[PDB]
């Protein structure tokens, strides 16, 4: 609608689909989030990536 963009997630990488009846968007529901994931950020943060088939150290 024509409301204030004051939600905590305004300008986030994932888009939400919410409901609201007030002029402030932080009053909105939690809604549905976008299902993106990035495991590598934590599970594989190596500079030079190695294959599954290869010997990790050579």
């Amino acid at each position: 609608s024509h409301e204030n963009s004051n939600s905590a997630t305004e300008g986030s990488t994932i888009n939400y689909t919410t409901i609201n009846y007030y002029k402030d968007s932080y009053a909105a529901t939690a809604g549905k989030q976008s299902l993106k994931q990035d495991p590598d950020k934590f599970a594989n943060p190596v500079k030079d990536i190695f294959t599954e088939m290869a010997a990790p150290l050579k």
Partner: protein, 242 residues
Amino acid sequence: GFPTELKPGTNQFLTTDDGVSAPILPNFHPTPCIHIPGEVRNLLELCQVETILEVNNVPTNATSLMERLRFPVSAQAGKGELCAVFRADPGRNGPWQSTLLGQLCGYYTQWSGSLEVTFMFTGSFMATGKMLIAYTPPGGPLPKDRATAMLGTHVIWDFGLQSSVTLVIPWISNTHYRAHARDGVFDYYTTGLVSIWYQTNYVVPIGAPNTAYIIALAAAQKNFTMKLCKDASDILQTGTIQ
């Protein structure tokens, strides 16, 4: 006014209800969000990160707690002796409780997917050896010997330049999801057993220690998911927190 009629549920406060509530500060705009490293989006991202599995969960006095993080291997008498065993059930009391996977797992009623345990050998470079790591699916009792364990899913690990090996505990279940297993009728959801045996022997030359340790790291595979959000079994508070 417009004709309406109140239905059951009226006035109730459901803690998980996702509704709309009046805002207390009209026209308020939050501090912009700068870039911060390491944002997480799904708990599943964390379930794929290996954390230390306390296979050796026996010592309990404060000064010996660190010993739970690693277990030993040493020169044997070649009778394919047993090194260690543990249940593969990730949401059950035991070794998995030390892992982040086990803990996050505690906030969900059901889980599904394959797991993986990577073992890192920390003995000297001059030490060699071959171990047999086996996963026994449900129904099979603790293998009495190596010949029995060998009949299940297993890996034969050879010590060398690559310090570690990974045992995959493939999802082999009758149901699409398992609830947390425990003694009693819920053992219906047990995942199985993992046993480690000496395939050959821990061999070392003159001058190197006769005992070394293995550190186990565990996490979930990419087909792993969890469902039915619940409270964890622990509540870390005795009286009131002041």
